[PDB]
Amino acid sequence: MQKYVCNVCGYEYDPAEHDNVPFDQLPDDWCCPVCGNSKDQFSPA
């Protein structure tokens, strides 16, 4: 259940915090809910 970290603000997308919804199921236009950084500028962590 891969966690991802925003390269801009350090927000961590942890699927565990979201009913195990994986990063790869998020919308095409999903952005960081803290800083609005785009999905494709997150690192696996």
Ligand code: NI
């Ligand atoms: Ni961010």
